Chain length 310, copies 4
């Protein structure tokens, strides 16, 4: 099987690295405007393969994406001093108007996995331009925020992250919704589990954890300039779910007909991931405060998309 | 690291095979009264290692368990031509009186993982004889039952079993409790999830599944004569959690001070598993019906233990 | 991807178990005349999946094999007391004459992996009946003998088997050829490495090791009746190489146009294994003594396949 | 188990990333003068864990290395504009003079794995300053050059790199030695194997491959600015060999008493890797030209180390 990655920057390359180390696919193709950049990352990653799994890693053109079961869109415009959030959005939408049709021309049957930020709006753009069934276009969404939420809770509880069933929904950003209400561990309410563990989650602890998730990216960027290991692994995990027709449940972004009264908007909800991309959407147990948060998050994304024309 | 397995029958050897294939430990030692048997299994598994991971698989004596972080107790007696079950229960308790002291004498710090049936009572016996803290003695318990419940639900919902958070508690027997009330998928009640999945769980479906779990072993024995693959993988999973100090949550058996009223009895509950064995016990959200069922199970188990004198 | 296994005995089930534990394929189908048996094993293995990877394990008929990229042929051998060598052969050959066309009818593109013994003769038989290119029909051959040679050398040298580059060629039987002449570790001749390691291989050690390989199966059977863990892993590994189009080198059996003179004979040689089965065959450096022993090995097999009618 | 990494740049972080994704150790500690850099990388990697294996990833000080079984030394100062490699070497040696004692103060029994370049010289420095047994100080050496040699050959032959038994010895640099003489695939000499595969290695192909290996870093740097994925996977693989007491053979750098008549020099040769670091060294079959090449490489490295006072 083959996986394509358009945009060979830190995110696209870290993603290829994860796919290689975990042996998700026999072939990985990197495509970038800067051909020398993609070739360098590709050789660097190919050299890692003898230590792990045989994988044909190479740089290429859109045409080289032929036959790919999934293509990760991690292409973005370089940020500069004095660039509002909207200015970025417009520029990246221009990038996608070029990339999407070019990718689909070479790999018409590929599932598109959107990473470019703002991921929810870009997922909407990809969806509109692709003219494919809604589920064929998936955005990473809050899959990384959910991981962050689980990792911070795990550190507080001294339990493996994978045993912490907590979710983050809505916008991958400021208005995201941490679903404390139905969070559970071992089949019991999170707060109740924490107490039993002797590591109760006080209101102070919860506010601190909220900040940790919400300000996660900002803090990482402050220390190293950009984030990429976390998303790289999240993208690789989603790619594997797709290539293996896993039918696993993840909080990812996709075109949603209606959510809390907001129509035609892309945001994250728990969904079933398989060979055709998203093949099922679930609407979880939300408290009133959470439903309110979700509505607001959806309206924010709806207006951002609308202003752009999608 | 080293893992020991006392009792090289189908269960014990199947566990060793899974451990080797997954490369959980650098060394696996098999010990059995029938040395030819243990040696045959050890060589057969050793021959599989070049296809998987480097593991020194070998047969030996109790002294060869020295240094083992975990030792699986899968040693039991063969049923006689015209004997009952309580007959075996006493016979096996005598095996443990020989095995336990000999094990802890060679590996004083090892965590004991009990597989021998009846697993719950055998766990309490191991507990009494070991003179180690409660958590150091763990029984497979309903770990396999929980696995069957998720597998059956997975087939019905067409989702990965790992995405189905449903548990089976109590006795690893007919009095086990299927926790339907708190079962969830994607943070949604099981029934509601099945609904939105277009694969609703009718009263009949639930009844058919409930029976598929309870009669699982019976059905397999009818066609195979015994079960080993399922439990072998479960035991290997638990050994891995222990060696890596995972801190993962599983439904396993352990000496419990108080459960739904009953006192000092070994039964399954969701517990945190790590280097010291079980290091935390929690009680899931149960319905009135399930509570009563769990109490009955505990009472039933308490009575059985007392009778043997443990 | 789907993998099929015909014959749910100990070999067939152990192979399925390894495939499940390693998550090689999303679906594994067991097919066996003894329907209850295949169902018992399928169920036992399915229950292990929640501990490893999501795999749809089930029992079924030939039609359920459609889409399978690889089908393991492990059915036959059911010798009667007093029954002759050839007599048993004819009975197996007949089984194959019925199984092969039915499997290829359901999955025409599937690669055939033969396990039934005598594997070399049964591989030639499946080859003639299949009407497919020579590489589409692969036999386990000396895959296990090679693993045994490495394992025993590994124990003597105290190094990982994967670092011992030694092979066993020819027939998977008494005529097998242990290639001592060109065996190497770290790019150094075996004997020269052994000495540098402070663990020289005396003529006594070699004879002993040679005996440990040749009598491997015999010794295991004395202890537990039959072998299956070693071959189960080997088969699972070859299936993985095929499903992932690995292009890895293994000593397996396949119809061979010419071997040291003998024409049209099936036996083991280092071959490149990929999605189309074997796609390359080479002859390692052999010493006069090894080359001659291989020729006689090819002769025996040649005569054996003829007498049978293939 | 715990692994420490001093130097949280791209190499150090990429290494921690591979370790986390592969679940090599339960705990990974990143130590860096730039505290915010190490914290940001640690959080970014911690966030990837829910998608793979539970690993406590964190930034810390030397005291946090306590109990570490292995500590990767990837520390180095940023090169100044116009500064030469030799001038940079002096500064990095001073860093080691400070780093080595601190590491050993906190983790006296740890194996030190050197990554900072020039790796052979820095390994010699680490060795002299450490005062530990020779095998306890290991340098990545030519592990990556060997990987590159195999990757390039694999692409030419269209076979898995792990099936290509070729090595690169001596200096991790311009004088490195490509051991063409004893390189083999399937027990067959490399050139002979290439012919059979129908992809012969012409003099021109061999020269191109030599340049491909020798100029690999240079070529990646001109496109990416630096290399890190390849070495990150190689370092992680070595760490794993150490923690599991693998006893695997790899081409790595370590203090060598005598090589081609050159005394007390650090360079790469095939070695056995286990819990104590390197526990055995062997000398591969070398042609006259390779021996000459190795001698020159060894002389270049001894002079280089001697100039620093090591
Ligand atoms: N979804 C998440 O959780 C998440 C996490 C981290 C980063 N991101 C986002 O992913 C994007 C990329 O980040 P990055 O750090 O890798 O940045 P870079 O490191 O800026 O990566 C962008 C690359 O895309 C390439 N590119 C632009 N147009 C292209 C085109 N038309 N065709 C092919 N390649 C093209 C560029 O040349 C550049 O190398 C950003 O929008 C970033 O904000 C998302
Ligand atoms: N926990 C579960 O869910 C589960 C699942 C399947 C089987 N089991 C149980 O595991 C046990 C073993 O099953 P099995 O199929 O391997 O049976 P066998 O095939 O009956 O295995 C028992 C082995 O223990 C050995 N033994 C007895 N005393 C010993 C001693 N003192 N020292 C060393 N070895 C000793 C015996 O020689 C025998 O080979 C049974 O009690 C079975 O009911 C439990
Ligand atoms: N082993 C190999 O084959 C190989 C391959 C590629 C790069 N490298 C080498 O690894 C080194 C690092 O490369 P990099 O790309 O990560 O560079 P960076 O990205 O330059 O990494 C160096 C980091 O170490 C930190 N540091 C310096 N002194 C320290 C000290 N005294 N204590 C704690 N931390 C300290 C610095 O703050 C810096 O962030 C270089 O010497 C590079 O040449 C080796
Ligand atoms: O804790 P449980 O109920 O045994 O579930 C464990 C399973 O949960 C998972 O973390 C998935 O959880 P989610 O479905 O909430 O995302 C798996 O990775 C893991 O195998
Ligand atoms: O010891 P080397 O030369 O680094 O080769 C190591 C590789 O050898 C293998 O054991 C394969 O050896 P073979 O090609 O002889 O079968 C791989 O599993 C392993 O990755």
């Amino acid at each position: 099987m083959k996986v394509g990655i358009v945009g060979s920057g830190m995110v696209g390359s870290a993603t290829a690295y994860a796919l290689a180390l975990l042996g998700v696919a026999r072939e990985v193709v990197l495509v970038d405007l800067d051909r020398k950049l993609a070739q360098a990352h590709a050789e660097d990653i190919l050299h890692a393969t003898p230590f792990a799994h045989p994988v044909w890693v190479r740089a290429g053109s859109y045409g080289d994406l032929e036959g790919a079961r999934a293509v990760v869109l991690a292409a973005g415009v370089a940020q500069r001093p004095g660039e509002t959030r909207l200015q970025l959005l417009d520029r990246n939408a221009q990038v996608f108007a070029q990339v999407v049709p070019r990718v689909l021309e070479a790999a018409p049957e590929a599932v598109l996995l959107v990473a470019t930020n703002p991921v929810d709006v870009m997922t909407q753009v990809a969806y509109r331009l692709s003219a494919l069934p809604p589920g064929r276009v998936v955005g990473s969404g809050t899959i990384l925020d959910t991981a962050r939420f689980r990792a911070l809770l795990a550190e507080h509880l001294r339990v493996a992250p994978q045993s912490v069933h907590a979710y983050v929904l809505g916008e991958h950003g400021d208005s995201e919704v941490l679903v404390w209400s139905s969070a559970q561990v071992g089949g019991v309410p999170l707060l109740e589990f924490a107490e039993a563990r002797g590591r109760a989650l006080s209101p102070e602890d919860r506010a601190r954890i909220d900040e940790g998730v919400r300000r996660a990216a900002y803090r990482i960027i402050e220390g190293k300039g950009a984030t990429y290991y976390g998303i790289g692994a999240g993208l690789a995990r989603l790619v594997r779910a797709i290539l293996t027709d896993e039918k696993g449940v993840y909080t990812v972004s996709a075109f949603t007909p209606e959510v809390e009264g907001v129509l035609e908007v892309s945001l994250s909800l728990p969904r079933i991931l398989g060979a055709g991309g998203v093949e099922g959407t679930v609407y979880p147990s939300l408290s009133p405060e959470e439903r309110e948060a979700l509505r607001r998050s959806a309206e924010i994304l709806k207006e951002a998309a609308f202003a752009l024309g999608f």
